[PDB]
Design a protein around this nucleic acid. Structure first.
Ligand code: MG
Ligand code: ZN
Ligand code: ZN
Length: 1259
DNA sequence: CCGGAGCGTTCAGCGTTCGTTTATCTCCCCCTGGCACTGTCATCTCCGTCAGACCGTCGCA
DNA sequence: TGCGACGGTCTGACGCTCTACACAGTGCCAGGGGGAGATAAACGAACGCTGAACGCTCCGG
């Protein structure tokens, strides 16, 4: 389990694994249903089908286990041994493996210098091959064979001359006799014409016999190894004419005979020689050939296994034939493929037994080879073997691949026991850490524990009686159930589970109904909505699992979302509206009892219950001792003649009753919050509470906030009648004026003075102006009292666009294929659309639905790719010895006379760590190795700093992984990241979580294609794939003079760098936009055409820091366009995992291949060991590569096998004979060992616990 | 005042009879072998992916 | 050889579950070797049968 090897399995290994020969094709008997002898499903080879029974019906008893039956040879043992015992099929003629031959040429490898079409010709029995030639023996006796050929030519010419003389005599004789007989007037001309026709035909066959002799001579003269011969007649006449000189064969046996004598070390030698000198695509050919051949040199596995003689068989359980109801049978397609191979092998053996024609034997060997190929890969070549006539049979590989393969459907993700699922309901009566399971769910989940406690409580005599009562379901079972499930957490989980908070451990609690009762305060972190969403409940089982549920997983410890550090367990739908109504100012609502002193909040509550004081009214309310005053009230303390402090003393405040209640919700140590709460300030309050109070106190305060928010939202005066939604009264006249001027334009267009396109453009412009103006009128119309504004201005639920298109006009709405109708929807949803206006609304609606479906699909795909590329990076050191960092800006866009901090400081500089101390006047403002929060950043920007050096992960160098300090504080705990936290998966999920939340598509292309770059999720995936964007913006290599060259066929730009640097020319199309000055000043910074720069050349000509900044800035500017906030360290992790590979050149002294994928640490180690040897180091360039290519090119082939290309990497590992170290997480999920992240580390599992001496002395 | 016949238990003679095997006689099964006018090249997939690579191929320059 | 483009090749293409299902057109008989399965006999052992025999308490003239 330390190491998991792979390689080519030669026939010796197959025979070692095998336990017999599957000689016969049949599987089971047709009446007794017993497995056959020495055939498929054989009990002698694979093992018995029952337990400790044998085939011949004897030896049914268990006592004499491990013996061999004399009658039938079946070993008596368990029935599960048929899951692990394999045999083999002995093939009469060798066949090739379809994985290596007929694949990617990087894995075919050109090990023999043959074209793939030549292989198709040779091993599919359509063209011959010469396997061996006695070249030195052929060249030794050249004068003798030349003399024999000369003798043959001489006798050919002699017999031609004799035949010519005889034909001349015959022609003269017949001409003389037909001119002397005089049978006809011109019969001599006819016989002469016939004679000359005979002349030309016999001369033709003479030149033809000469031609075949010449062609066989020049064919034999240039015969060598690796020679093919398509024509069977030509090879036959070489065999007949010339003997024991060249050896050839037919089919895959030719490859075996070539490979047994194939000399490959000198092949690598001369191939290195042609690597050293040459030019062109020959370099690439020899490069791939040397990268494949050198695998067989260093490794000890012989290359014999590419062509095979034996075929191992799957054990019979894994290709079962199971009995069903009604007598029907169901078998796997592997049994059918094995049956086909066995039938054809038996028929080939039968043909080899007797004397058979070569065409029939060759066709039999071809169909055998094709059947073996179909067994290894059904559908790789040609029409797949269908079978029933509907679908192709699934081969071995066809279930090692894809969504139906073992890697992705049964190894990474598995079904589980002790799990349950039902719909969800909201329960406000629960705490933060409680969930309500039904009775049936809790009984079926906790059934074995219930039986154990029932036997312990002796309600049942033994286990069977306990099970009988549980199945019957008596009330004592429910009582002991309620006694059991407490102090036993369960894992709740939603199916999408987009991010880390999709699994949260609650404490179960018995409730009635058939639905899981769930705290509303946490349902937004699940993305849960109570509309039939079904949540599965998984049960942690051992002590370790429920301990990790209690400590790591509890719902009262997951306040802060790891995506941005913002609180996520304070939802907004209903409680925020209640607190808004509780704490808002009295505007538009009649304030009763406005401006009267109150002794305490109790007297105010009594007055409010009486009815003479409204909830929001500016009153002077005195507060008892211990209440902390507001942040703004401490300096404006009540004026004092003697020295006094208002910090712990009583005070009077000008605040409403509702704010006093709200500060009764918050803890006593919190300062009196004295403003409109809404949502954003509530998020800030919850963030401050989480940052400055322990977890249990924060859970209690949010539970109080939930309860009071619901209580006051019931009485908040929100409701939606149709009078509450109000249309602007000015909308009628605004629309009337705009349609009047539209009518004026329409009669203006009717005269043809303007085109249709210009009219459409100006019409959509003026109608956009109209909808913006009526939106402004709508904002100016509504008061603060109506509930729609009260639930949209409080951050509760809704945006201003929705209220704009319910009250005001719906505005402009798109057509099919992304254009705009000149006529907008002038009717509001309160007024109600007309027929066709509603039709054009449906145009946009269905496109939006299809867009969000495809968007969530591609978001899941990007999330998976990010998880693969960004995994196996884990915090593994406490601190580095480094001091280098990143120059992240802190103060930007300062005005005249003032300094302003950066706008995106909250996602970039926050939650990081300083690389070194900062000084402005010789004194440190912020110490090194501390987090950067609000107060410290405010102090720095007040002192007058412009940029800071943050110790980020891109500059982190370490012996293994990354350290905690260089990564920065974790955004999910609010503290420093613990050693072992799997930061890579958290980063990948945080990038992939708002993929469905982007909801972006290009509104209009402007009538031209290609002018607009990719937007939204396609832009993000194009950035992370390191691909060249669709809008390419070239960058000048050096500063110099740049001018345009407007060639008519294709535009052209030319930049001439100064200082004697070489001219570089960039090709640009005849497209509309180019922003560079002709004969103007240019440098490396700017871009010749506005567009997305290709980041490959950015890295090439600017540096690693510049390309890191560019990538981070681009993805963050995509994400910030929608409102989703992702911290930049999550991107920086993927970018660091992205630039790790380095491309090397001129590696003539570093003794490895130049111009491939080389790891950075390995390249540095090679440089160190070659400068230790004295040789000059090889050059190297960093290579920005995509997430997919970096995921495939990994050390552990199990992780790459679990990814997309699972056939290429398996063949690659088999050829390279690479064994993977099990450092990683996919390769530890598959095996079932503990993952090396978090609790699974070595430094945590190696603890020994013992009580102290005074502890055992006490008891 | 010990004798006797009757009664309880305990083993060896021969006499049949179960306990356990064997080859013989119907019945069915199963694999190989046999058909003697002539009748000598079928079969129908596969389209409104799909997106952009990734690649070697391959003819033109 | 460098060029494009033409081409084949190849891969996935968010997620469980309330739900969930099954699947079709062209020969025939005789002769012969195995093995299960019924028949009656047969080798071997013990299971009954013959009362007889060892030996006591026994009512007894
Ligand atoms: Mg839902
Ligand atoms: Zn047996
Ligand atoms: Zn570090």
């Amino acid at each position: 389990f330390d190491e998991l090897r792979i390689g080519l399995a030669t026939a010796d290994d197959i025979r070692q694994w095998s336990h017999g020969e599957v000689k016969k094709p049949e599987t089971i008997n047709y009446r007794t249903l017993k497995p056959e002898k020495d055939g498929l499903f054989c009990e002698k080879i694979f093992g018995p089908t029952r337990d400790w029974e044998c085939y011949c019906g004897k030896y049914k008893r268990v006592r004499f286990k491990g013996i061999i039956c004399e009658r039938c040879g079946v070993e008596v043992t368990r029935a599960k041994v048929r899951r692990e015992r394999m045999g083999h099929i002995e093939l009469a003629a060798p066949v090739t493996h379809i994985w290596y031959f007929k694949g990617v040429p990087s894995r075919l490898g050109y090990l023999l210098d043959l074209a793939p079409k030549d292989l198709e010709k040779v091993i599919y029995f359509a063209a011959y091959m010469i396997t061996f030639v006695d070249e030195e023996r052929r060249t030794r006796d050249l004068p003798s064979l030349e003399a024999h050929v000369s003798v043959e030519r001489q006798q050919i010419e002699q017999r031609r001359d004799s035949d010519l003389e005889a034909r001349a005599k015959k022609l003269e004789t017949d001409l003389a006799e037909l001119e002397a007989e005089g049978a006809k007037a011109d019969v001599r001309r006819k016989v002469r014409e016939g004679a000359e026709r005979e002349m030309k035909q016999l001369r033709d066959r003479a030149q033809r016999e000469i031609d075949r002799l010449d062609e066989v001579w020049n064919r034999f003269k240039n015969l060598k190894v690796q020679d093919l011969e398509g024509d069977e007649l030509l090879y036959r006449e070489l065999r007949d004419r010339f003997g024991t000189y060249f050896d050839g064969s037919m089919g895959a046996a030719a490859l075996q005979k070539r490979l047994e004598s194939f000399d490959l070390d000198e092949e690598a030698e001369r191939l290195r020689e042609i690597i050293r000198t040459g030019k062109g695509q020959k370099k690439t050919r020899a490069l791939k050939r040397l990268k494949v051949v050198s695998a067989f040199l260093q490794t000890s596995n012989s290359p014999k296994g590419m062509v095979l003689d034996c075929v191992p068989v799957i054990p019979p359980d894994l290709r079962p034939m199971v009995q069903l109801d009604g007598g029907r049978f169901a078998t796997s397609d592997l049994n059918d493929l094995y049956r086909r191979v066995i039938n054809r092998n038996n028929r080939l053996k039968r043909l080899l037994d007797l004397g058979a024609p070569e065409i029939i034997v060759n066709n039999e060997k071809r169909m055998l080879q094709e059947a073996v190929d179909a067994l290894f890969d059904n559908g790789r070549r040609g029409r797949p073997v269908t079978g029933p006539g509907n679908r192709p049979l699934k081969s071995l590989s066809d279930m090692l691949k894809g969504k139906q393969g073992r890697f992705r459907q049964n190894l990474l993700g598995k079904r589980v026991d002790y799990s349950a699922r039902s719909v969800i309901v909201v329960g406000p009566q629960l705490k933060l850490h409680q969930c309500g399971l039904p009775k049936a769910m809790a009984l079926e989940l906790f059934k074995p524990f219930v039986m154990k406690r029932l036997v312990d409580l002796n309600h049942a005599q033994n286990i069977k009686s306990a099970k009988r009562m549980v199945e019957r379901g008596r009330t004592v079972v429910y009582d002991v159930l309620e006694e059991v499930i407490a102090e036993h957490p369960v894992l709740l989980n939603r199916a999408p589970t987009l991010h880390r908070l999709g699994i949260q451990a609650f404490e179960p609690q018995l409730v009635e109904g058939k639905a899981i009762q769930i705290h509303p305060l946490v349902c937004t972190a699940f993305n849960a909505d109570f509309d039939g969403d079904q949540m599965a409940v998984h049960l942690p089982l051992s002590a370790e699992a429920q301990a990790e549920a209690r400590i790591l997983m509890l719902s009262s410890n997951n306040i802060l979302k790891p995506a941005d550090g913002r609180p996520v367990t304070m939802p907004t739908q209903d409680m925020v509206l209640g607190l808004f109504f509780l704490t808002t100012d009295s505007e538009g609502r009649s304030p009763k009892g406005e401006g009267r002193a109150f002794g305490s909040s109790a007297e105010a509550i009594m007055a409010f219950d009486a009815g003479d004081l409204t909830l929001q009214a500016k009153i002077d309310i005195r507060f008892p001792v211990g209440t902390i005053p507001p942040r703004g009230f401490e300096p404006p303390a009540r004026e004092e003649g003697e020295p006094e402090w208002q910090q712990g003393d009583t005070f009077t405040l000008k605040t409403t009753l509702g704010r006093a209640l709200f500060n009764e919700l918050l803890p006593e140590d919190y300062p009196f919050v004295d403003y409109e709460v809404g949502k954003k300030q509530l998020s800030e309050i919850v963030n401050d509470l989480a940052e400055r109070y322990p977890k249990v106190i924060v859970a209690a305060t949010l539970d109080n906030l939930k309860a009071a928010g619901f209580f006051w939202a019931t009485r908040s005066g929100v409701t939606v009648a149709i009078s509450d939604i109000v249309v602007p009264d000015a909308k009628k006249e605004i629309v009337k004026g705009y349609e009047g001027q539209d009518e004026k334009v329409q009669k203006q267009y009717e005269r043809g003075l303007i085109t249709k396109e210009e009219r459409t453009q100006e019409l959509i412009a003026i109608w956009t102006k109209a909808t913006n103006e009526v939106a402004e009128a709508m904002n100016d119309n509504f008061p603060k009292t109506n509930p729609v504004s009260m639930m949209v201005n409080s951050g509760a639920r809704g945006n201003m666009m929705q209220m704009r298109q319910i009250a005001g006009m719906r505005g402009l709405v798109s057509n099919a294929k992304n254009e705009t109708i000149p006529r907008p929807i002038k009717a509001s949803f309160r007024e109600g659309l007309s027929v066709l206006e509603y039709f054009i609304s449906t145009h946009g609606a269905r496109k939006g639905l299809a867009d969000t479906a495809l968007r969530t699909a591609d978001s899941g795909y990007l999330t998976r790719r990010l998880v693969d590329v960004s995994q196996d990076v884990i915090i593994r050191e406490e601190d580095c010895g480094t001091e280098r960092g990143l120059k992240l800006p802190i103060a930007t866009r300062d005005a005249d006379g003032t300094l302003r901090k950066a706008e995106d400081v909250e996602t970039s500089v926050y939650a990081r760590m300083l690389a070194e101390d900062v000084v402005i006047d010789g004194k440190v403002i912020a110490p090194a190795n501390v987090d950067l929060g609000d107060v410290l950043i405010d102090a720095l920007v007040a002192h007058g700093v412009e940029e800071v050096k943050t110790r980020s992960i891109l500059t982190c160098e370490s012996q293994v992984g990354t350290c905690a300090m260089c990564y920065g504080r974790s955004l999910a705990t609010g503290k420093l990241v613990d050693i072992g936290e799997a930061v890579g998966i958290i980063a990948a999920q945080s990038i992939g979580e708002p993929g469905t939340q982007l909801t972006m598509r290009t509104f209009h292309t402007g009538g031209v294609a290609g002018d607009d770059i990719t937007q939204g999720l396609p832009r993000v995936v194009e950035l992370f794939e390191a691909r060249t964007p669709k809008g390419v913006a070239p960058i000048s290599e050096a500063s110099g003079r740049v001018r345009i060259e407007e060639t008519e066929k294709t535009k052209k730009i030319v930049v001439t760098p100064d200082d004697g640097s070489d001219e570089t020319a960039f090709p640009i199309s005849k497209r509309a936009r180019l922003l560079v000055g002709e004969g103007d000043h240019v440098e490396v910074g700017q871009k010749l055409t506005v567009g997305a720069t290709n980041p490959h050349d950015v890295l090439r000509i600017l540096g690693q820091r510049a390309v890191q900044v560019h990538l981070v800035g681009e993805v963050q500017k995509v994400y910030n366009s929608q409102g989703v906030s992702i911290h930049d360290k999550h991107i920086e992790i993927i970018i660091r995992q992205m630039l790790r590979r380095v491309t090397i050149i001129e590696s003539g002294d570093a003794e490895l291949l130049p111009g491939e994928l080389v790891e950075r640490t390995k390249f540095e180690t090679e440089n160190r060991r070659v400068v230790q040897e004295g040789g000059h180091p090889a050059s190297g360039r960093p290579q920005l590569m995509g997430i997919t290519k970096a995921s495939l090119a990994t050390e552990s082939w199990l992780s790459a096998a679990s990814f997309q290309e699972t056939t290429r990497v398996l063949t690659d590992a088999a050829i390279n004979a690479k064994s993977d170290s099990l450092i990683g997480l996919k390769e530890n999920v598959i095996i079932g060992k503990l993952i090396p992240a978090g609790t699974g580390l070595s430094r945590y599992r190696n603890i020994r616990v013992e009580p102290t001496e005074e502890a055992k002395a006490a008891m």
